[PDB]
Amino acid sequence: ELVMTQTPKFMSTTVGDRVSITCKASQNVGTPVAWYQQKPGQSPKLLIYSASNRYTGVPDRFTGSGSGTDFTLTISNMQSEDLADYFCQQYSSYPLTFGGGTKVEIKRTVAAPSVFIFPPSDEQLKSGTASVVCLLNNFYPREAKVQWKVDNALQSGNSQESVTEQDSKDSTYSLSSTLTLSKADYEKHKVYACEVTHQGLSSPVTKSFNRNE
Amino acid sequence: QVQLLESGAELVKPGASVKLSCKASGYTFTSYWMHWVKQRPGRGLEWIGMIDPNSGGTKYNEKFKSKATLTVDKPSNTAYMQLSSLTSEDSAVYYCTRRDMDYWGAGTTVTVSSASTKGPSVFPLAPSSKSTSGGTAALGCLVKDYFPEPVTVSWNSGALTSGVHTFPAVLQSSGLYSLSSVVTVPSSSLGTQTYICNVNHKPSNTKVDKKIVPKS
Ligand SMILES: CCC1=C(C)c2cc3c(CC)c(C)c(cc4nc(cc5[nH]c(cc1n2)c(C)c5CCC(=O)O)C(CCC(=O)O)=C4C)n3C
Ligand SMILES: [Ca+2]
Ligand SMILES: [Mg+2]
Numbered sequence: 134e135l136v137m138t139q140t141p142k143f144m145s146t147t148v149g150d151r152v153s154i155t156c157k158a159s160q161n162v163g164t165p166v167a168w169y170q171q172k173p174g175q176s177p178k179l180l181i182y183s184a185s186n187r188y189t190g191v192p193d194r195f196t197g198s199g200s201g202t203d204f205t206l207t208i209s210n211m212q213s214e215d216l217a218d219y220f221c222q223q224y225s226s227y228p229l230t231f232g233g234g235t236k237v238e239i240k241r242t243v244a245a246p247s248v249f250i251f252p253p254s255d256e257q258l259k260s261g262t263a264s265v266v267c268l269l270n271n272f273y274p275r276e277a278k279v280q281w282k283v284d285n286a287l288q289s290g291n292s293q294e295s296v297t298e299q300d301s302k303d304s305t306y307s308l309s310s311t312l313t314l315s316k317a318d319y320e321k322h323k324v325y326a327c328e329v330t331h332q333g334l335s336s337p338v339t340k341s342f343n344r345n346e
Numbered sequence: 347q348v349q350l351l352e353s354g355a356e357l358v359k360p361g362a363s364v365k366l367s368c369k370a371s372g373y374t375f376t377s378y379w380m381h382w383v384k385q386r387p388g389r390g391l392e393w394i395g396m397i398d399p400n401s402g403g404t405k406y407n408e409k410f411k412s413k414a415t416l417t418v419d420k421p422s423n424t425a426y427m428q429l430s431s432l433t434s435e436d437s438a439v440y441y442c443t444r445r446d447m448d449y450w451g452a453g454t455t456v457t458v459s460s461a462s463t464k465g466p467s468v469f470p471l472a473p474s475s476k477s478t479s480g481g482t483a484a485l486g487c488l489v490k491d492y493f494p495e496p497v498t499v500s501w502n503s504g505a506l507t508s509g510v511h512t513f514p515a516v517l518q519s520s521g522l523y524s525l526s527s528v529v530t531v532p533s534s535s536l537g538t539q540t541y542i543c544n545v546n547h548k549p550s551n552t553k554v555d556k557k558i559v560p561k562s
């Protein structure tokens with residue numbers, strides 16, 4: 134099938150530093166190789182074709198190299214605008230093949246999250262359930278621990294988390310922790326707290342509220 | 347300006363088929379080969395095969411020869427990809443791309459399931475509820491219990507883009523999706539500025555607008 138093996142799968146790099154992505158062809162392909170860039174939510178963009186031909190509009194920051202079965206994409210100067218995924222392709226023989234891709238992220242200094250808590254809305258409660266949302270805004274690195282506490286009881290198995298892709302303007306991440314409880318359980322309890330432990334915090338900060346009203 | 351328009355997300359029942367469309371504008375249609383690519387989460391990209399919008403000639407990726415069927419229609423410059431006997435394996439985001447792949451469609455998310463469609467319920471995430479902190483305030487909308495993906499969110503009809511965070515959706519245990527979209531703004535804008543999240547779920551033809559006022 135003329136498999137294109139791409140490596141590494143993941144790479145993290147500081148703005149100002151360089152990055153190299155490589156694709157090994159199972160067979161000889163010659164020069165018909167290309168590369169694409171894809172950020173979250175958008176479609177792939179043509180970056181390079183002919184192994185080293187740089188599509189119009191694409192900065193010299195990107196450079197394609199190699200020939201035969203060894204090809205490489207290089208970002209001579211990693212910048213905020215390069216935060217995305219990268220795919221290599223081969224079009225010397227049918228069927229056309231793609232590389233496994235590379236999630237290219239940015240490495241930066243540690244940053245502590247700003248924490249907010251959101252009590253369920255009056256509207257939702259009459260539906261028969263409650264949602265309690267805790268938010269960890271703009272922090273780094275991705276790794277984070279969030280625990281819930283109601284009337285001081287450490288909840289478990291009743292919360293789900295979601296994490297944003299790395300932000301281009303900040304190079305930071307964000308996270309939301311949603312606690313789901315019944316209108317019942319929720320009206321018989323009062324103190325809802327969100328505890329956040331993270332590298333940028335000298336000790337875990339906690340956000341909470343009372344079931345006011 | 348080349349633009350490849352692809353149909354809205356599709357929810358398809360197992361064993362049925364679906365016909366995805368890709369209408370070309372901004373260039374001579376019968377002038378370029380059109381491809382189709384399949385993309386699954388944390389998965390590589392896959393070329394399905396291409397078709398000649400002029401000759402009718404078609405070539406396929408040997409692995410998709412049995413499930414995919416490519417065609418076109420000059421009168422409408424629209425290309426079509428039909429998939430048959432769909433299974434959860436065909437669930438993915440499909441794209442159509444020009445011959446050299448310098449132009450891509452936005453993509454059509456296809457989900458294969460026996461579960462029925464369901465529009466999202468949208469709840470407000472009250473600004474600095476009661477206790478108004480200092481500097482900047484956060485607020486948003488909880489969009490939950492909808493099926494299948496995707497769902498689009500915008501603030502004040504696209505007028506607000508600064509400080510907006512729309513979290514990736516997570517499948518709840520109920521088999522229903524859920525997510526929150528938040529935005530951070532100056533606490534002095536509250537009350538005076540009206541924040542409205544516009545949620546869309548094309549699969550259920552659902553369109554919601556929700557005002558977010560400072561918790562009371
Ligand atoms: C996805 C892979 C791919 C990439 C990347 C690619 C790159 C590319 C670009 C973009 C910068 C341009 C302007 C041309 C430039 C060209 N590309 C092609 C022709 C092709 N180019 C093809 C594939 C292909 N071409 C295929 C497949 C054909 C075959 C079309 C056929 O069946 O005759 C031609 C010849 C066709 C013509 O202009 O009449 C030029 C010129 N190609 C080589
Ligand atoms: Ca930069
Ligand atoms: Mg969320």
Ligand code: NA
Nearest residue numbers: 172175178214
């Ligand atoms: Na971009």
Ligand code: NA
Nearest residue numbers: 375378379380
């Ligand atoms: Na075309």
Ligand code: NA
Nearest residue numbers: 544553554555
């Ligand atoms: Na609307």
